[PDB]
Amino acid sequence: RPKPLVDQRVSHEQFRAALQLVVDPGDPRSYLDNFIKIGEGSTGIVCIATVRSSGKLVAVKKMDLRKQQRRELLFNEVVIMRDYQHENVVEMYNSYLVGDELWVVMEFLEGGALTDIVTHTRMNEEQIAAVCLAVLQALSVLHAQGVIHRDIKSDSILLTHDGRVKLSDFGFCAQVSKEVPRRKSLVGTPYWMAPELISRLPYGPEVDIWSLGIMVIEMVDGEPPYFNEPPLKAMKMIRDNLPPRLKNLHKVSPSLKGFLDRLLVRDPAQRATAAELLKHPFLAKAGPPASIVPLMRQNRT
């Protein structure tokens, strides 16, 4: 799997001191048991744990401070989830600092990543629409406050046991305001990266819309475009070539096709916004959380 990409006393100790003030005080082990690793990411490992009193399950993301790509991005993990409590957003209960590590205590998502489902089986339009709705609902709220996710991919999308979709992995979030027009840093996963971002030109919230476009290709075709190619020239191909098309538009309804045509636009000014796309006819096909349950590993094949 391709890993997410981003382009000392005073340095460390000051940064630690900063995070100390941001997070909740104390240590989570005073009420949590059985820290067992689930999977490693880019920022660090995610592991499971139990509430000692109730017996209920939580997740704990552990991120090392001195083992970061770009330290200052760790603030996102705390803040984004703190502020934007939304139906389609992973809940954060608490954040703590332990030694050289940040420990964010968030909700455990049973269904796992959307990556797992995209590669193994391949969903129908009803289910694909259900996902896109859930992501766009979340992304509209973030874009409303001028917050770019910067890392939209199947890996970022997680599920509950009852098939509800939530967005996660906010470690690459950007801020844009009245005085800050666009960002300009090379951030995200290589394949899901927008064309203007790969050319290092100033980019806005639109790079998420494109990223979702690529994530649509994922659900339909199993892979993002050029996934077989090495990331280096795969990014150059996105920068040079026309917008990637689907395998064959034969079984694809014109509803979905016209939807994706708004997502994968080269010129970001013409590219549709999260607000618009919420009213696109394709999202009317979106099935209930129940219709996603069959896709999950436990009930698959």
Ligand SMILES: Nc1ncnc2c1ncn2[C@@H]1O[C@H](COP(=O)(O)OP(=O)(O)NP(=O)(O)O)[C@@H](O)[C@H]1O
């Ligand atoms: N609360 C959760 N419950 C279950 N699985 C999770 C949870 N959070 C993350 N995961 C999965 O654990 C895997 C490893 O962590 P990952 O999300 O890759 O970290 P990461 O890449 O550092 N995120 P980012 O903040 O974007 O850098 C991911 O692929 C997720 O699918």
